[PDB]
Design a protein around this ligand. Structure first.
Ligand SMILES: Cc1ccc2c(c1)CCCN2C(=O)SCC(=O)Nc1ccc(S(N)(=O)=O)cc1Cl
Lengths: 545, 405
């Protein structure tokens, strides 16, 4: 396979560093024999070359058989030189999403034998690529060699190669805008919407372009046929999808089985709307060994079921059409879990996805929903170069109420209410004003940093009162506890004056679900109530309260 | 033009900052701009042997249809700061903030015809990304002094001076401060005279290639934190009143509260109007008095970062404070409003940055009341400045909000 008349990328070792100089370990005779055999072969091809022991550099070489087979492969251990080579420009720093590919009439796959070995290596560099095939046991000088092309497993090979590939294609692109080439590792995806005819022509005209450059490839009758497996997907002429997923049947699950399962599902949820996973996850937390068997929860089991339901019989995604619009719809699926779909024509998804994480310790739905929107917005810009029109389960009003009085700046792009329950709502407002004729509780909470015990309690203004003791708490915990008491002993309407910015903050947020248990109660209170007005003041600057 | 040699800061090396997903329209814009600059020899495609990277965006700028390229050198600037600042640093006229009129003139073009030290270029690598990662981004580096790099003005200072020398001689009472790509020209003239002098100045520039913003500093002042005035006072108000008062001391020396306080004591109903003693009427007052004054005791330490905090107050309005040291404000003001929250925060940020440049010659570090992601995705829609300051994202204390309302 040829060796590219192309330019060369000047490499360099890291500042104040020198080449490698590692000693060659003794080798067995057969290993030594294979190397001699392999090298003179390579060397015949100018891939490598003989050098002196004047050249002071050395990296080690090894040689193994091959799994089961009867051949011999040469290993070079570039670790050290790799660790002295300049950093390069990260290779491919994203990968296309099938959902974003513009559909094409016809596309074929070209690949490339001797990827790295078809491209030259900056000359002043080869000196450091020095290795030595040692002589039978200790005796004698080994044979010394170095690279002319890009060695496998050296730091720069992937960048330089992809770079070269780009420089090469450059022209052929210029004179062929209607044609798209996706470079990947050492594969070539090429597509056009020109008729079966000049396609293969155009292909050949490409294989040639590649030849004039030392790049050799399969010809018709050698290249694969649709659906192309790639990066986990299945890419057909019309649709695309994730690859065959097999969720096995078993009696016992180990922490391993379940991890692998969660992974397959997450991967599948790109295009299978509805996939659930949280019951399965719970099973993972605070975890024992990998070999450990976890008894499936019943809820967990329902998931495993509801999941096979979805996966039973295939779903595909459509390609993208730069002309029409992007619509994204989201649904609340349950405890901080959200799910979405994007399509351009009612119900032919280009993709689906899910969002769950828990931003914060206390959050409400409206918050969560806008986080999804942002997460979907980014993913979208990356994929399509534009943001989609959204459809959300929230009234314009609910949304306008919350943003309006929220401390934090906020902002969803274009959307429209859509009526698909659960709808998103605020589960309670808090008063703007003190409530005339309704008890004023002044609550407080303290905690001994030492004993760790705390009093929590309140004293209202119809001279009522309570106090309580708490065995293992903190100030924070006590102050939530006071507000909790005051909320309990007061029915429908009540004013509460805390001097806890902490509790205040949390509650001004309209949380509606919270990691904290205690906060959740306060919440069940808050919904039961009918008119709550909460107010802060500084303490130890001791006041009317 | 032999080039002035540029060093990085010892022991550290160039930026490798990830580029931001960009929308199609912006990518197209950047492909045009970057084609044309390559032609003009301003930048050159580079090869995988450059690991460095700096993000790049396109903006539009107030009342302009023309896309324009904006490189984000925040990372590079910290990694060079020894050069641009302590080494070739531009002095700062305390005078500028006094003048009746300050016009701000874009001067980025200047730089474009000074060569960048050959061994520094690799540090200015940027990328134009492609949608869906379908093709490797186009990678470039600058050959001439780049805009938004703090090195550029530093290097280009002496040319600036020659350029400005004659006009300076002829108008010895017009201050001219340069900060990055902009020139700040402040005069005490009738506005029309001012404008003429600006035009006149434009000519001078225009003869070396060079080629708006009308500010009136001297008429910037307080924002005295305001204590409600009113006949009648619920416990609530007095509560809310002391509370606010409470906040004010700590930055305001001499504040006073306990007098007002004894009005409180005992579990009275909130919504209960209550008699008002008139010495506690004096604290009110004399706090009010002080409350309009500068903080006695607060100075700008030129060796210390500035910070600017911003709070949201519905009704399209936002408050903000600049200081170097929590609670000791150097300054504090407000902004007022088809605008959304972000659009507003963005306008506000620029407003303050630019006041801040005029007063101190440096830009503050912003603490923004917004989600990291949101700010990031959205801000370039509104950004019009040629610089980019530093920012973080924070969760406005519940009360900070009011003590300033
Ligand atoms: C990894 C990868 C896969 C696919 C693609 C790319 C990269 C970039 C070029 C575009 N591309 C495509 O395959 S999209 C074209 C499309 O809509 N699908 C398609 C169309 C026609 C044919 S055809 N008629 O069988 O050649 C096959 C396919 Cl898989």
């Amino acid at each position: 396979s040829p060796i590219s008349p192309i330019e060369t990328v000047p490499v360099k070792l890291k500042p104040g560093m020198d080449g490698p100089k590692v000693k060659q370990w003794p080798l067995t005779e057969e290993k030594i024999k294979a190397l001699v055999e392999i090298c003179t072969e390579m060397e015949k091809e100018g891939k490598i070359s003989k050098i002196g022991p004047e050249n002071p550099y050395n990296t080690p070489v090894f040689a193994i058989k091959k799994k089961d087979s009867t051949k011999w492969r040469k290993l070079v251990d570039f670790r050290e030189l790799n660790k002295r080579t300049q950093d390069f420009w990260e290779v491919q720093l994203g990968i296309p999403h099938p959902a974003g590919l513009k559909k094409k009439k016809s596309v074929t796959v070209l690949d490339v034998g001797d990827a790295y070995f078809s491209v030259p290596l900056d000359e002043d560099f080869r000196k450091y690529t020095a290795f030595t095939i040692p002589s039978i046991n200790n005796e004698t000088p080994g044979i010394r060699y170095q690279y002319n092309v890009l060695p496998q497993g050296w730091k720069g090979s992937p960048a330089i190669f992809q770079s070269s590939m780009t420089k090469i294609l450059e022209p052929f692109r210029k004179q062929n805008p209607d044609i798209v080439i996706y470079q990947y590792m050492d594969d070539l995806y090429v597509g056009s919407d020109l008729e079966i005819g000049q396609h293969r022509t155009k292909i050949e005209e490409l294989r040639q372009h590649l030849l004039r450059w030392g790049l050799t490839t399969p010809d018709k009758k050698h290249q694969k046929e649709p659906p192309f497996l790639w990066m986990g997907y299945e890419l057909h002429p019309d649709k695309w999808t994730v690859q065959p997923i097999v969720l096995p049947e078993k009696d016992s699950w180990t922490v391993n089985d379940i991890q692998k399962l969660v992974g397959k599902l997450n991967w599948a949820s790109q295009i299978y709307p509805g996939i659930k996973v949280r019951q399965l996850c719970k099973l993972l937390r605070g975890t024992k060994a990998l070999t450990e068997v976890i008894p499936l929860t019943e809820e967990a089991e329902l998931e495993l079921a509801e999941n096979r339901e979805i996966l039973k019989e295939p779903v595909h995604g459509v390609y993208y059409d730069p002309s029409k619009d992007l619509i994204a719809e989201i649904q609340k699926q349950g405890q901080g879990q959200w799910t979405y779909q994007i399509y351009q024509e009612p119900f032919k998804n280009l993709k689906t996805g899910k969002y769950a994480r828990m931003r914060g310790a206390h959050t409400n739905d409206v918050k969560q929903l806008t986080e999804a929107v942002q997460k979907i917005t980014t993913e979208s810009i990356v994929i399509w170069g534009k943001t989609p029109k959204f459809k959300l389960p929230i009234q314009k009003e609910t949304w306008e109420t919350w943003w309006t009085e929220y401390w934090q700046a906020t902002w969803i792009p274009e959307w429209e209410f859509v009526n698909t329950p659960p709808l998103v709502k605020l589960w309670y407002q808090l008063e703007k004003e003190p409530i005339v004729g309704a008890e004023t509780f002044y609550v407080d909470g303290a905690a001994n940093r030492e004993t760790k015990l705390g009093k929590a309690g309140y004293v209202t203004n119809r001279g009522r009162q309570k106090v309580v003791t708490l065995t293992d708490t903190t100030n924070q915990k006590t102050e939530l506890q006071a507000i909790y008491l005051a909320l309990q002993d007061s029915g429908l309407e009540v004013n509460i004056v805390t001097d806890s910015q902490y509790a205040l903050g949390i509650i001004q947020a309209q949380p509606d679900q919270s990691e904290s248990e205690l906060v959740n109660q306060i919440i069940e209170q808050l919904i039961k109530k009918e008119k709550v007005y909460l107010a802060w003041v500084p303490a130890h600057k001791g006041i009317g309260g | 033009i032999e080039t002035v040699p540029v060093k990085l800061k010892p022991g550290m090396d160039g930026p490798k900052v990830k580029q931001w997903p960009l929308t199609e329209e912006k990518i197209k814009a950047l492909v045009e701009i970057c084609t044309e600059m390559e032609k003009e020899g301003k930048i050159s495609k580079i090869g995988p042997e450059n690991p460095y990277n700096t993000p790049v965006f396109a903006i539009k700028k107030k009342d302009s249809t023309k896309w324009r390229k904006l490189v984000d050198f925040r990372e590079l600037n910290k990694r060079t700061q020894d050069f641009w600042e302590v080494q070739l640093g531009i002095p700062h006229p305390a005078g500028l903030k006094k003048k009746k009129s300050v016009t701000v003139l874009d001067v980025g073009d200047a730089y474009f015809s000074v060569p960048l030290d050959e061994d520094f270029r690799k540090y200015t690598a940027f990328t134009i990304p492609s949608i869906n990662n379908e093709t490797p981004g186009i990678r470039y580096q600058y050959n001439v002094l780049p805009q938004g790099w703090k090195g550029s003005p530093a290097i280009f200072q002496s040319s600036m001076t020659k350029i400005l020398e004659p006009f300076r001689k002829q108008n010895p009472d017009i201050v001219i401060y340069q900060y990055m790509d902009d020139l700040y020209v402040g005069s005490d003239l009738e506005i029309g005279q001012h404008r003429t002098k600006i035009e006149e100045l434009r000519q001078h520039l225009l003869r070396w290639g060079l080629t708006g913003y009308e500010l009136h500093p001297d008429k910037w002042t307080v924002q005295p934190i305001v204590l409600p005035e009113k006949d009648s006072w619920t416990v609530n108000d007095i509560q809310k009143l002391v509370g606010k008062l409470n906040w004010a001391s700590q930055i305001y020396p001499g504040i006073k509260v306990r007098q007002l306080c004894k009005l409180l004591r005992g579990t009275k109903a909130l919504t209960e109007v209550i008699p008002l003693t008139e010495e506690a009427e004096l604290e009110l007052a004399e706090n009010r008095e002080i409350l309009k004054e500068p903080v006695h005791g607060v100075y700008y330490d030129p060796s210390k970062d500035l910070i600017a905090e911003i709070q949201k107050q519905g009704q399209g309005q936002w408050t903000y404070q600049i200081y170097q040291e929590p609670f000791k404000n150097l300054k504090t003001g407000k902004y007022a409003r088809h605008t959304n929250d972000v659009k507003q925060l963005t306008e506000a940020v620029q407003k303050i940055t630019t006041e801040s440049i005029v007063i101190w010659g440096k830009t503050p570090k912003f603490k923004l009341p917004i989600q990291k992601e949101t700010w990031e995705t959205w801000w370039t829609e509104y950004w019009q400045a040629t610089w980019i300051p530093e920012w973080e994202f924070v969760n406005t204390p519940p009360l900070v909000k009011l003590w300033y309302q």
